[PDB]
XYZ file of N, CA, C and O in Angstrom:
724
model
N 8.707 7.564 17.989
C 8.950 6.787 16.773
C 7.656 6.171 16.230
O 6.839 5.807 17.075
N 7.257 5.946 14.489
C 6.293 5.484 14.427
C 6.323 4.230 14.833
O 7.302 3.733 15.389
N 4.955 3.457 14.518
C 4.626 2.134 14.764
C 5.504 1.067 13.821
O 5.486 1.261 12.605
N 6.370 -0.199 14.424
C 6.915 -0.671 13.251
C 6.365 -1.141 12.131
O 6.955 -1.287 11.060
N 5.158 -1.401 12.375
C 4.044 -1.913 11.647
C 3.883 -1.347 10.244
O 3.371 -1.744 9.197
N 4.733 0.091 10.779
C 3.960 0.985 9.228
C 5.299 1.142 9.080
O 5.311 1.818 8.052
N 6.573 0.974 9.423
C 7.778 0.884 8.866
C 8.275 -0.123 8.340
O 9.502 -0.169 8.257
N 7.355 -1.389 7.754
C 7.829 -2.779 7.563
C 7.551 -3.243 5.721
O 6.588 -2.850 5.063
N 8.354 -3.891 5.347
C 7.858 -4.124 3.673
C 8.022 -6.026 4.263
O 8.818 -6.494 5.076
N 6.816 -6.799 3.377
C 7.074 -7.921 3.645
C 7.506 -8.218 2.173
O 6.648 -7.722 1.443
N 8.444 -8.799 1.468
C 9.528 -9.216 0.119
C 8.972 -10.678 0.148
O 8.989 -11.484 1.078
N 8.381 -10.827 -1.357
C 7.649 -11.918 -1.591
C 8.659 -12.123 -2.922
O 9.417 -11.251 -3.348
N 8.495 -13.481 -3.482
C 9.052 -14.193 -4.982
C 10.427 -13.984 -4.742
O 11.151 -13.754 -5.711
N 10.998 -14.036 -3.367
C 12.252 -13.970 -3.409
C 12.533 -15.584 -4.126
O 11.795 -16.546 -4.342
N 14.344 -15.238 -4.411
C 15.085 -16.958 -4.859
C 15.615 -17.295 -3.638
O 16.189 -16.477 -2.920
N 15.433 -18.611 -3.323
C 15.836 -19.432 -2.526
C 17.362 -19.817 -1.738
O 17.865 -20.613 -0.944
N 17.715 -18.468 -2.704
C 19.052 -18.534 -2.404
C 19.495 -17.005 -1.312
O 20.339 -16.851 -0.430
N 18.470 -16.102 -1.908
C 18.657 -14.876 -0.400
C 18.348 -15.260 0.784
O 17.441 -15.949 1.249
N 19.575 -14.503 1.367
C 19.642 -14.653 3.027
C 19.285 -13.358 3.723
O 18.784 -12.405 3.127
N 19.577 -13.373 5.054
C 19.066 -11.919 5.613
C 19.973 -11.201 5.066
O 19.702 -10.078 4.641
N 21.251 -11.748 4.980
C 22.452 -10.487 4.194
C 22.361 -10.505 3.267
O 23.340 -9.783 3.078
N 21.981 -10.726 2.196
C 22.290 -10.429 0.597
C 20.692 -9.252 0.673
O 20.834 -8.246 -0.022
N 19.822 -9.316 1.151
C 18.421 -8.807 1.457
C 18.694 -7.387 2.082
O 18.025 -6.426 1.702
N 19.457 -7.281 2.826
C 19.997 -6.341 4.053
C 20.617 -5.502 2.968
O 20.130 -4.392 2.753
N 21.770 -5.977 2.178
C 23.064 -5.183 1.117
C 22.026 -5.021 0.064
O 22.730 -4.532 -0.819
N 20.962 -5.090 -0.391
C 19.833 -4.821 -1.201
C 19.162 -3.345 -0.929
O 19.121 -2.372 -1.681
N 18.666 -3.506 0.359
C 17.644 -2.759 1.010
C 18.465 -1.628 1.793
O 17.824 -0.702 2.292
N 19.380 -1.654 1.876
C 20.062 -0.903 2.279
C 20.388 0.642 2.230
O 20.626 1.445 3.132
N 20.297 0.804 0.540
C 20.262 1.779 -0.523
C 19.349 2.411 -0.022
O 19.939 3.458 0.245
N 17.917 2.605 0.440
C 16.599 3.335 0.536
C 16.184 4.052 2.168
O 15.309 4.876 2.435
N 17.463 3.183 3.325
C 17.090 3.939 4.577
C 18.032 3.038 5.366
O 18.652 2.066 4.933
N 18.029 3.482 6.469
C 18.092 2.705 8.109
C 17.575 1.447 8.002
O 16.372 1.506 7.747
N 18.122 -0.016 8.119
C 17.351 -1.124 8.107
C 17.400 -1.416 9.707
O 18.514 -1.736 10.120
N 16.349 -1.351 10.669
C 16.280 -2.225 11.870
C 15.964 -3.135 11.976
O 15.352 -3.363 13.019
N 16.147 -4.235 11.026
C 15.461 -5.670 11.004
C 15.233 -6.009 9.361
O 14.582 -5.449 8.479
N 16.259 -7.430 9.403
C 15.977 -7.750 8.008
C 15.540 -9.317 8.260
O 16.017 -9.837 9.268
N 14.794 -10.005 7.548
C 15.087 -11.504 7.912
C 14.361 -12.409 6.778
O 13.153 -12.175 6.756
N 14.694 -13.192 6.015
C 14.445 -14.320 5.346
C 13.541 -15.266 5.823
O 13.972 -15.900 6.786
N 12.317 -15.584 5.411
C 11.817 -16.832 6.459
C 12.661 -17.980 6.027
O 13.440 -18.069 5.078
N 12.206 -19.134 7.262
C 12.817 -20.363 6.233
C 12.239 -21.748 7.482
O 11.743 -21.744 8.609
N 12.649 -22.775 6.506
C 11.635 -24.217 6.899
C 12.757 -24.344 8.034
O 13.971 -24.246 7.856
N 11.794 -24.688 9.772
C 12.424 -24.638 10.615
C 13.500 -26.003 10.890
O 14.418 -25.998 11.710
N 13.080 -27.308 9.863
C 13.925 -28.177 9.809
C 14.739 -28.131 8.882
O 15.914 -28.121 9.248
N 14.479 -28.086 7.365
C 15.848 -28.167 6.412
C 16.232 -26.526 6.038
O 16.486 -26.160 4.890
N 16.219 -25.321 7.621
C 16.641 -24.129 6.908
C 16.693 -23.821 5.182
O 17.494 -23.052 4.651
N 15.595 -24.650 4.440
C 15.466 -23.957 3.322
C 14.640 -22.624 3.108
O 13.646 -22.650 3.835
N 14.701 -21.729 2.523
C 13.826 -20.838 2.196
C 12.685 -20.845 2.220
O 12.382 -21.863 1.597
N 11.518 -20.210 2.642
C 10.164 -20.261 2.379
C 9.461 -18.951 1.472
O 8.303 -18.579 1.282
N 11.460 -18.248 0.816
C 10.738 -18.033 -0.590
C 10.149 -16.005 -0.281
O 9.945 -15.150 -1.143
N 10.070 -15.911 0.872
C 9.811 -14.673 1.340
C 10.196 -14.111 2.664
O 10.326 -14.921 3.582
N 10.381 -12.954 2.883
C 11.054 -12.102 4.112
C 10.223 -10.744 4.030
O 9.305 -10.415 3.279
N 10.983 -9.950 5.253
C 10.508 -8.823 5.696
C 11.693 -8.065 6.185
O 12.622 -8.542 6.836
N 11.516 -6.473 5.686
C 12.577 -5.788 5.528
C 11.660 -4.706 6.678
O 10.444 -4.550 6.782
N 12.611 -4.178 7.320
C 12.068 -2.725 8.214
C 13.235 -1.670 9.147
O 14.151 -1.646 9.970
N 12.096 -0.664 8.006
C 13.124 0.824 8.325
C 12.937 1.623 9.047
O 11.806 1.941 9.413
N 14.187 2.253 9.513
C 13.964 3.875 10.402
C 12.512 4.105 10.170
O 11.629 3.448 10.722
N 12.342 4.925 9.451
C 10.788 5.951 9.319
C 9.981 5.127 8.305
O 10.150 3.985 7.875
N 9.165 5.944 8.087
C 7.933 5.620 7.272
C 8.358 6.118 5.561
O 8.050 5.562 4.506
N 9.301 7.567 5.836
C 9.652 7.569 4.398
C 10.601 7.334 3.758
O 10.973 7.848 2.703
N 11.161 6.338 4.519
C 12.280 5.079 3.509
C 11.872 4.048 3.085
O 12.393 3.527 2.099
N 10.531 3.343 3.924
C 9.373 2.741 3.228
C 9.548 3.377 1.900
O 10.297 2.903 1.046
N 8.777 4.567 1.717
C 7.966 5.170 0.722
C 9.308 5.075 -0.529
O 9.064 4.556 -1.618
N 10.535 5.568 -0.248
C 11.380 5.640 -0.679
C 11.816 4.148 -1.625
O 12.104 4.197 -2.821
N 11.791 3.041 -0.918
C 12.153 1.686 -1.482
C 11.010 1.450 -2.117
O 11.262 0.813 -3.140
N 9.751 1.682 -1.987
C 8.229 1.467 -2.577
C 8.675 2.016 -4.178
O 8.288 1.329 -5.123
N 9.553 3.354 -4.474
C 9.013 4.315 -5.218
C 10.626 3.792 -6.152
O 10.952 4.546 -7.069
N 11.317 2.850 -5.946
C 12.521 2.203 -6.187
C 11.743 0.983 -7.075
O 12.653 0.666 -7.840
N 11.254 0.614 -7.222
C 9.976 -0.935 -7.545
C 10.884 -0.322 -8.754
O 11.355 0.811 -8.862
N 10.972 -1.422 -9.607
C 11.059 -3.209 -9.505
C 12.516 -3.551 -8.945
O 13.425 -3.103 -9.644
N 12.854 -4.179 -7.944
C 13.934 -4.661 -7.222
C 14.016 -5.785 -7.541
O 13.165 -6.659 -7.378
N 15.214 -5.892 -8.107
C 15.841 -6.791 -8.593
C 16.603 -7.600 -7.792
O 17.737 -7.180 -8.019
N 16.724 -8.669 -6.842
C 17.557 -9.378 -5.929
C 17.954 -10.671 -6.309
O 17.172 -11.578 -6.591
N 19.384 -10.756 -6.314
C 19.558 -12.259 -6.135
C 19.462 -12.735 -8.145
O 19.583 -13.910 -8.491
N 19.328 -12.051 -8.766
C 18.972 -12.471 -10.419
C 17.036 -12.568 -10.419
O 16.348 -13.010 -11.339
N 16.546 -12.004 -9.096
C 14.873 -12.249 -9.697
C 13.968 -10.761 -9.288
O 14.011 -10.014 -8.311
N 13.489 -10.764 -10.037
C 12.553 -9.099 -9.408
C 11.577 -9.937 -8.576
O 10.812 -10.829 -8.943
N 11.830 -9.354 -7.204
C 10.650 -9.629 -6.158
C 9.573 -8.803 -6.275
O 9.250 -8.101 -7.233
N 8.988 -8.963 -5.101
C 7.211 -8.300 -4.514
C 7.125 -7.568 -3.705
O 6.666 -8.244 -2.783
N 7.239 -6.654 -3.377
C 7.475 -6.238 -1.797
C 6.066 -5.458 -2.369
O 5.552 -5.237 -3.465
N 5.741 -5.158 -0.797
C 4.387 -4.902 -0.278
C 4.281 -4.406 0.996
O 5.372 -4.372 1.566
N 3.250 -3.963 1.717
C 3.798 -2.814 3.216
C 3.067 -4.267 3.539
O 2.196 -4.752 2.818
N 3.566 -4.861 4.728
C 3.655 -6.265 5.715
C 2.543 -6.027 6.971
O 2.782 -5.390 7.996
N 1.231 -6.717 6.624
C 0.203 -6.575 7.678
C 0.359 -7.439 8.584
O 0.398 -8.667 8.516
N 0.475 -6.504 9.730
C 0.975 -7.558 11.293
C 0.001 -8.562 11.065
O -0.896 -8.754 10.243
N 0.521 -9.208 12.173
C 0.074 -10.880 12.346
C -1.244 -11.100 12.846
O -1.752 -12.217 12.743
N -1.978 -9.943 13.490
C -3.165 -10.063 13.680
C -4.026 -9.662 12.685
O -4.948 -10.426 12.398
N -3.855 -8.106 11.818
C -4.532 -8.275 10.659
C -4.882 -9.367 9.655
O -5.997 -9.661 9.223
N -3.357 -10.062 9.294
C -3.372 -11.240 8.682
C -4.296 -12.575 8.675
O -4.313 -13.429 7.789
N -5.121 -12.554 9.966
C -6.381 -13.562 10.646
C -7.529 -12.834 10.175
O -8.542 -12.883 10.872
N -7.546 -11.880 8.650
C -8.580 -11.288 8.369
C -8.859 -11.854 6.574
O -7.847 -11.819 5.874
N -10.142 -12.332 5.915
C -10.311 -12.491 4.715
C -9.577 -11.791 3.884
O -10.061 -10.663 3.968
N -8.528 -11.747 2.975
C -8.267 -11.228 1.585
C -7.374 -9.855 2.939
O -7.079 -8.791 2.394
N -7.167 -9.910 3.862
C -5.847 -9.053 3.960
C -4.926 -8.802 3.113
O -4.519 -7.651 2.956
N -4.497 -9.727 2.501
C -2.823 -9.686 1.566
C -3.626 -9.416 0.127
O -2.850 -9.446 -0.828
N -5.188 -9.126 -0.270
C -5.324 -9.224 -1.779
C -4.905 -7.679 -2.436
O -5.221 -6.607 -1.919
N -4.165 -7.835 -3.627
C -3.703 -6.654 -4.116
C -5.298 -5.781 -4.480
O -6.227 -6.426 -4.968
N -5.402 -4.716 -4.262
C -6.909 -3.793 -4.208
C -6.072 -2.513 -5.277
O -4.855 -2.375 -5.398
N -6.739 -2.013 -5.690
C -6.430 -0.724 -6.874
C -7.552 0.209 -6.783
O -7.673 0.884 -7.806
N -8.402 0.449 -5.872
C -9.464 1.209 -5.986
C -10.171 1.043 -4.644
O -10.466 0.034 -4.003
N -10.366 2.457 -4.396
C -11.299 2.920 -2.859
C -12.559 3.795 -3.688
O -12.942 4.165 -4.797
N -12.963 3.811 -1.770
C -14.667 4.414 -1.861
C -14.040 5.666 -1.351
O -13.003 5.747 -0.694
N -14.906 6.736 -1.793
C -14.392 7.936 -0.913
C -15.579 8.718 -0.707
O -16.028 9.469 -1.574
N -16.193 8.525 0.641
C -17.097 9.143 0.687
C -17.320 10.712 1.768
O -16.344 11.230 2.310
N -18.367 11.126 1.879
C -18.723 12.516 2.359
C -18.324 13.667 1.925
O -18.073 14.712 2.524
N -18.271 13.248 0.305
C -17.618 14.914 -0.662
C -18.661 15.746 -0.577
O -18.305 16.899 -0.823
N -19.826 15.644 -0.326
C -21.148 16.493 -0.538
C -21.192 16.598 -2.229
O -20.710 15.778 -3.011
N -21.975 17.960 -2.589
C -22.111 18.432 -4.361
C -20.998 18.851 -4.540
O -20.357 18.139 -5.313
N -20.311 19.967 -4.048
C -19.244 20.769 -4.093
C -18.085 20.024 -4.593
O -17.310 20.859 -5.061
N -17.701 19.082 -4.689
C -16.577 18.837 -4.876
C -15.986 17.957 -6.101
O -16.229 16.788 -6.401
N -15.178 18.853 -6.675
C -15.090 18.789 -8.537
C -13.570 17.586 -8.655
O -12.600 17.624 -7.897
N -13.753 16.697 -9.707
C -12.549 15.979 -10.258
C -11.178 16.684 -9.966
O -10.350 15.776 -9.886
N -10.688 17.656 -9.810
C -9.252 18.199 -10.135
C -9.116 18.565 -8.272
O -8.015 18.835 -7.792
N -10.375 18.518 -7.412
C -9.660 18.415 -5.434
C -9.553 17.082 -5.753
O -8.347 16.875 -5.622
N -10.185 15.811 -6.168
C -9.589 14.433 -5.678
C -8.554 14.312 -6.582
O -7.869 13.341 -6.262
N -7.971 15.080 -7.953
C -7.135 14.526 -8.156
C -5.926 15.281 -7.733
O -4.977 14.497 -7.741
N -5.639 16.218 -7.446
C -4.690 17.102 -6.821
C -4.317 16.207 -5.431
O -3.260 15.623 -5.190
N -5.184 16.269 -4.841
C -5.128 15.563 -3.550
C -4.718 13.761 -3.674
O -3.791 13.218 -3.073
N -5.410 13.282 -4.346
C -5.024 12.013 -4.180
C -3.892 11.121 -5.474
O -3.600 9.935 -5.624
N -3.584 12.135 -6.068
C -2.815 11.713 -7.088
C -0.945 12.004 -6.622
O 0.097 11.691 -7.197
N -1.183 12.605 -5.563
C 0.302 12.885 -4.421
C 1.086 10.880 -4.128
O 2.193 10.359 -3.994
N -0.592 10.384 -4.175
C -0.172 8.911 -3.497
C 0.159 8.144 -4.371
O 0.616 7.052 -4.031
N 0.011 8.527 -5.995
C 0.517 7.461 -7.317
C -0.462 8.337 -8.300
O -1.281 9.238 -8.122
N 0.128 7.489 -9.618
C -0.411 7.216 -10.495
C -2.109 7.335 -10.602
O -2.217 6.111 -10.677
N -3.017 7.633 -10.647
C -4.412 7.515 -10.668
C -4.995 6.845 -12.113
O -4.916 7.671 -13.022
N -5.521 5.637 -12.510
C -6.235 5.635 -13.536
C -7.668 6.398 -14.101
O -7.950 6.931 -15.174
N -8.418 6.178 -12.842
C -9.812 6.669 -13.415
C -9.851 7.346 -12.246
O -9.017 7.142 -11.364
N -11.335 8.669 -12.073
C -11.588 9.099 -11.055
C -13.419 9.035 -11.571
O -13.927 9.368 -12.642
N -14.006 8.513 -10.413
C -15.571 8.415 -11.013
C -16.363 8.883 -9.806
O -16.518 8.282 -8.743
N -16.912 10.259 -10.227
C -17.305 10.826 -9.446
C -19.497 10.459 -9.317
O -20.301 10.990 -10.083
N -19.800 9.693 -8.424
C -21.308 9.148 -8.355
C -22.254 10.477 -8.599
O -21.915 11.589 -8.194
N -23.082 10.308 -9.080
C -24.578 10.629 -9.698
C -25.572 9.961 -9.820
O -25.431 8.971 -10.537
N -27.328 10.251 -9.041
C -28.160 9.755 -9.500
C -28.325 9.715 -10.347
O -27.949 10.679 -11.015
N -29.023 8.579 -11.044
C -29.120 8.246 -12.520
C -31.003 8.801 -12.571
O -31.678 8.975 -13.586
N -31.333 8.926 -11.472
C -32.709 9.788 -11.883
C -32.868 11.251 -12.083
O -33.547 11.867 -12.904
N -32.055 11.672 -11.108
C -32.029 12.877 -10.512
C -30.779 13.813 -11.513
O -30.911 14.903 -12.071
N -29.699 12.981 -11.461
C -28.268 13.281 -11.828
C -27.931 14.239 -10.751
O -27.292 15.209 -11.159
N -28.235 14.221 -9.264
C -27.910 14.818 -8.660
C -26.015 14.181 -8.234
O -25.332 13.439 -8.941
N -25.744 14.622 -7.281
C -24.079 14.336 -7.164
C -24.692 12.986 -5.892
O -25.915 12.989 -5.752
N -23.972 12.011 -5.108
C -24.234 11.428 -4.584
C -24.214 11.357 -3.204
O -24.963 10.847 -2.371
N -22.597 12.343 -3.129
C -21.743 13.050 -2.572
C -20.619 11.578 -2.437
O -20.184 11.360 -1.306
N -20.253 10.769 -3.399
C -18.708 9.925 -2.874
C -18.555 9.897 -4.685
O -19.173 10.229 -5.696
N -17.210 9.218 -4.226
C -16.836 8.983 -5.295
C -15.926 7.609 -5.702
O -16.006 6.739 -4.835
N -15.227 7.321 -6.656
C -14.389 5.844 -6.618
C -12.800 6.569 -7.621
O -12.619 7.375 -8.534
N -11.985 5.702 -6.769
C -10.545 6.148 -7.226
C -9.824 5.158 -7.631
O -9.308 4.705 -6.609
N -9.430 4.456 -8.673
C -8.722 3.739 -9.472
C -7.424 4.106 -9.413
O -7.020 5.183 -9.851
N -6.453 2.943 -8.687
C -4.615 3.812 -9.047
C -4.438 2.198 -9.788
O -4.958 1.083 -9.766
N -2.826 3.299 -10.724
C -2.270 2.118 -11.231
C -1.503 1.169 -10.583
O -0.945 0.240 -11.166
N -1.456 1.389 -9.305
C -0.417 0.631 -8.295
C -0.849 0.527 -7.062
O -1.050 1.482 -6.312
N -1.101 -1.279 -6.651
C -1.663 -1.225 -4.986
C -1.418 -0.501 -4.305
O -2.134 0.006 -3.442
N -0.017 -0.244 -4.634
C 0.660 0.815 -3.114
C -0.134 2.006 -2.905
O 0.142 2.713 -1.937
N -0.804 2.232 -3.452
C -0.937 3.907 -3.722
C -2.189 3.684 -2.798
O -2.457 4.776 -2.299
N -3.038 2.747 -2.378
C -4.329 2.557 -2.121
C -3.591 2.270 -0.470
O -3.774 2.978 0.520
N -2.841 1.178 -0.546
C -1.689 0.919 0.711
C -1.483 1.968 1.467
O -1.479 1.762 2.681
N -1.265 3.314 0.992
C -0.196 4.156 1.797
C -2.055 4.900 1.993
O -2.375 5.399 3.072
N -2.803 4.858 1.112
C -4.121 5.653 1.338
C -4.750 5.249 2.692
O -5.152 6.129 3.453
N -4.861 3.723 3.060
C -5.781 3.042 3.983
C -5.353 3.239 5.131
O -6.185 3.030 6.014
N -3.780 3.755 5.644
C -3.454 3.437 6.747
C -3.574 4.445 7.209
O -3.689 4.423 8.434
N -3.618 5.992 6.445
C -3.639 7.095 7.515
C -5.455 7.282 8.136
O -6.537 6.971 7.638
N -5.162 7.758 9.074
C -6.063 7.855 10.007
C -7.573 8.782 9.412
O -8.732 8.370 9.359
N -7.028 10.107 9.031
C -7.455 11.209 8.214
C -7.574 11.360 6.628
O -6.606 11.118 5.907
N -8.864 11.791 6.098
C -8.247 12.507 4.580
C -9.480 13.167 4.851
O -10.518 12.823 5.417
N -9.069 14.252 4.271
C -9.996 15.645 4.162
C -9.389 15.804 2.332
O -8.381 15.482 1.702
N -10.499 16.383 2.092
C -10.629 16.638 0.109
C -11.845 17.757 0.369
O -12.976 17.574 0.820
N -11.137 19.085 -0.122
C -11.896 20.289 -0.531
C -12.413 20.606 0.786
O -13.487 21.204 0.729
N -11.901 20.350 2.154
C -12.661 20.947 3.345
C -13.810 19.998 3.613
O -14.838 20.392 4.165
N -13.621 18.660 3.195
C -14.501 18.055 3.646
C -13.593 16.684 4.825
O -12.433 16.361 4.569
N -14.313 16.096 5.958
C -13.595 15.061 6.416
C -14.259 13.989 5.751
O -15.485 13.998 5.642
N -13.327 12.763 5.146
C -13.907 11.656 4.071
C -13.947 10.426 5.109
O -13.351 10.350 6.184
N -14.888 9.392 4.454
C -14.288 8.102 4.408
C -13.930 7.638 3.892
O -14.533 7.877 2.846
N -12.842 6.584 3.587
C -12.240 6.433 2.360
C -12.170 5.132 2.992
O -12.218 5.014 4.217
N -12.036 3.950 2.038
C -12.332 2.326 2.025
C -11.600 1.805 1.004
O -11.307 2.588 0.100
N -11.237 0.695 0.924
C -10.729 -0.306 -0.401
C -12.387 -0.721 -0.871
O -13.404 -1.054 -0.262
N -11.958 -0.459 -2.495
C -13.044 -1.001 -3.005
C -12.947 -2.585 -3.629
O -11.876 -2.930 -4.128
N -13.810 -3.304 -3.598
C -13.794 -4.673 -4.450
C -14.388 -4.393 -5.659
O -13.796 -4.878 -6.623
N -15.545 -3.652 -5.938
C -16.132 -2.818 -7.165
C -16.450 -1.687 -6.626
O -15.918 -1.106 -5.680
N -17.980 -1.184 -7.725
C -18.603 -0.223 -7.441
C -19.881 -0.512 -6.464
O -20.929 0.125 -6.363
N -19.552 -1.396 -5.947
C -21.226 -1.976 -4.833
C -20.689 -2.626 -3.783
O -21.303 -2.672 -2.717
N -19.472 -3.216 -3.939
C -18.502 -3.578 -2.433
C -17.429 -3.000 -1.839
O -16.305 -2.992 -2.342
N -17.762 -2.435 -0.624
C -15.990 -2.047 -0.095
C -16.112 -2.537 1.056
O -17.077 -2.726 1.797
N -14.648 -2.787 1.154
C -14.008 -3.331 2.595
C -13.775 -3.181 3.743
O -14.663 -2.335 3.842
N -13.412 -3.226 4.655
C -13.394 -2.959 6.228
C -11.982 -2.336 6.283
O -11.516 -1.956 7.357
């Protein structure tokens, strides 16, 4: 079985009024739920407003991801893939990112392999493939703009990406001069 880690959505802007069951009869629709739960203030059991939903596999995740905008309770929530509790002890873990580094394409490798290939994971806005500005030689990386965090989400966690026969690195970008760990 995979890791639950990568079977988990954490549900943010919930109303104060969902419980694990109204959350559960929600989420239900998209897979197998093994765990639903509401946080809440350990003295006046009020809401703290957000929970975490987790499914059978990885592609009932993908499935409820590709369901957005969920409507619960009278409010469209947030859901987001839920970084365990140790990632979470890391700077800007939870910041929404829309753009990676993708590097070790060499020259060879033309706009329509990264977008074939990486446009499987969403929406793509831009694709900007690097060039010396002296040389105009290729750089060999490139930068990938999606219209939707998720798409960068479901990018960071696999282990592998190969584009045109090449093995990449691929990173969250902050711009074009910072990427992330």
């Amino acid at each position: 079985k995979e890791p639950e880690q990568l079977r988990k959505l954490f549900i943010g802007g919930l109303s104060f009024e969902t419980t694990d069951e109204s959350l559960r009869s929600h989420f239900e629709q998209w897979g197998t739920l093994t765990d639903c739960v509401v946080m809440r203030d350990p003295n006046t059991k009020r809401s703290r407003g957000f929970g975490f939903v987790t499914y059978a596999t990885v592609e009932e995740v993908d499935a409820a991801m590709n369901a957005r905008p969920h409507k619960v309770d009278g409010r469209v929530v947030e859901p987001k893939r839920a970084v365990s509790r140790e990632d979470s002890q890391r700077p800007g873990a939870h910041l929404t990112v829309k753009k990676i580094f993708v590097g070790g394409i060499k020259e060879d490798t033309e706009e329509h392999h990264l977008r074939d290939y990486f446009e499987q994971y969403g929406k793509i806005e831009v694709i900007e493939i690097m060039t010396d500005r002296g040389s105009g030689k290729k750089r060999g990386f490139a930068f990938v703009t999606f219209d939707d965090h998720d798409s960068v989400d479901k990018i960071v966690i696999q282990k592998y990406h190969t584009v045109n026969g090449h093995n990449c690195e691929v990173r969250k970008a902050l711009s074009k001069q910072e990427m992330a760990s």
